[model samples]
Target: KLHKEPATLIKAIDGDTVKLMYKGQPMTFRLLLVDTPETKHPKKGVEKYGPEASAFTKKMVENAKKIEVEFDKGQRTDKYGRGLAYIYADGKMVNEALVRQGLAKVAYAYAPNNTHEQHLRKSEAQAKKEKLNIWS
Candidate 1:
C-alpha cells in the first residue's frame, strides 16, 4: 500500500510539474522521478516537444475526476521549496504516463524517493524502444 494526499489541480505548469490545492493551500509540486522538456524558462525558453508535454499534462488533470500526490519517505521538498511527489490522476500515476508517452524522461533519482523508480524506468524503456517523441 502507498501513502497519499488528496489534491486539486490549480494548473499544469508543464508535463512534470503542477500547482495544486492541498489542505486549503495552493502549492507547487515537482512531479517525482520524471523530467520533461521546458515549456517556460527565463533562459531556456521553449525546448523541443515542450508545448506538447505541457498540453498532455493539462489535458490529463483537467479531465481527471480526482487528483492526488504521494510524497516519498525521504524528502518532501526540493531545494527550491517545491513539493516533490508522485502525481496520480484518477487512479493512474501521471508521472509514468508521461514517460510512457515519451513526453518525459525518468530522472531525479534521489534516495528514498525512488519507491516507483523501477516501474517508471520500465515505461521509459518502452517509450525509448518505440522512439517516441523525446526519444525520437
Candidate 2:
C-alpha cells in the first residue's frame, strides 16, 4: 500500500524538510530520523555544511516523480507544527537517502516512532566509511 498519503514536492526547506502539494493544498513536512546542518539562522548566517545539504535535498526533490510522507502512529508534529513523516521519492526513501549520501546523520534521539532507524544507521555507517561530505 501507500503507507500514508502521498504528496508532490514543490520546494525544499533546508535539508530535512519540504513544501509539498497534497490534496490540492500545500503542507510543510519534516523528515523523520535525520537532521542536516542549519540553513536558516536568526542572527548568524548559514552553518558550515548547510548549503551543501540543502542543495542535495533540492536536487533530489525537484527530480523526483513524486514525494510522499508516511507518518508514525504516535509521532505527530512537534510544537513548531510541521508535519513529521518518513519521506519517499518515487520508490526510494528520502530520509535514508540523506544519510546514505552523508548529508545527514541518524538522529535516533528524536526517532521514537521511527520504522527505519536500523536501516538508516546502516546507511550512515556506510557513509562514514566512505567519508563523504560532512563525514569528511
Candidate 3:
C-alpha cells in the first residue's frame, strides 16, 4: 500500500467530503466509494439525515490526531470537480468508518477506483444487521 504525505484535516464539507491544506494549497476531496445524504440541493434543499451526517463527519475528522488524503491511482478527480480520494485518520480508513457507522452508503465507481468496495459493502451489511443509524 502507498499514500502521500499526511495532511491535516481542515474541515468537513459534508458527511463525506473535506477541505485540507496540503503543501500550502487548499484541496477538497470527496471520500472515495461512499455517499452521504445531501445537506444542500440546488432546488430540493436539504435532504433527510444530512445535517446529522455532516456533523458526524466533522466530529470524527476534527477529533482525529492525524489525517491524510490519498488519491486512487487513477482518475485524480470526479466529474463534479471534487478530488476523489481515501481519507485516513490516524492510520484508519475514515471512509470505511462512515459505512461501518451507518452514516454513508457505497457509491458508484470505475474499475479499481473501488479498491475498498468489498470491505465497504461488508461494513454496510453489518451496519444494516445491527440496525445502526442510517440502517435503523
Candidate 4:
C-alpha cells in the first residue's frame, strides 16, 4: 500500500515544501504531517525561526547523497495540486527531522497519510522536552 519514488532535488522551497524532479518532470511536494514556520507568506510574513527552518531543510537536501519521496496509501496530492509525501534524504525522513529538531510541528494529521503520525509526534514531544528552537 505504500511506495517510494526516487526524486532529484531541484530546490528546497521552504522547510515543508520541496521542488524535485520526479518521473522526469519537476514537481513540488508539500511534506505531509508537518508544518514549519512561514518564511515568505504574504500575510504571515516571516514567522519566528522560519528562516532557520528553511535553511535547515535546504542544507539537508543539498548535502544529501540520495533523495526519495515515500507516498502513503491515501491522497497523493493536496488541494493546491502539490504532491504530498514524506521526504527521505540519505535515508533520513526530513519530516521527522524537522519535528525532532523543533523546526516544525506535527500537523495536518489526516487518515491513511497518518501512518507515520505517531513517530513524528514522539519526535516532537522529545523536542519539546528538550526545549529546542521553536519549543524554546
lDDT of 3 at 41: 53
What is the total number of backbone clashes in candidate 2? 0
Question: Which one wins on lDDT?
Answer: 4
lDDT of each: 0.90, 0.82, 0.83, 0.92
Model 4, 7-102: lDDT tens digits are 999989988899999999899899999989978766998999899999999999999989999998799999988999999999999999999999
Off by over 4 Å in 2: 42-44, 110-112
Assess the local accuracy of residue 124 in candidate 1 as a C-alpha lDDT between 0 and 100. 96
Q: lDDT per residue, candidate 3, 67-114, as tens digits?
A: 877877678677887788888877788889888988888998777587
Candidates 1 and 4, the one with greater lDDT: 4
Q: Residue 64 in model 4: shift from native, Å?
A: 0.7
Q: TM-score of model 2 relative to the true fold?
A: 0.89
In model 3, pairs of residues that clash are none
Better of 2 and 3 by TM-score: 3
Winner of 1 and 2 under lDDT:
1
Candidate 4 C-alpha RMSD relative to the actual structure? 0.9
- For model 3, the stretches where C-alpha displacement exceeds 4 angstroms are none
lDDT of 1 at 67: 95
Model 2 C-alpha lDDT per residue in residues 41-76, reported as the tens digit of each score: 556658878898889888888898877778875666
lDDT ranking, best first: 4, 1, 3, 2
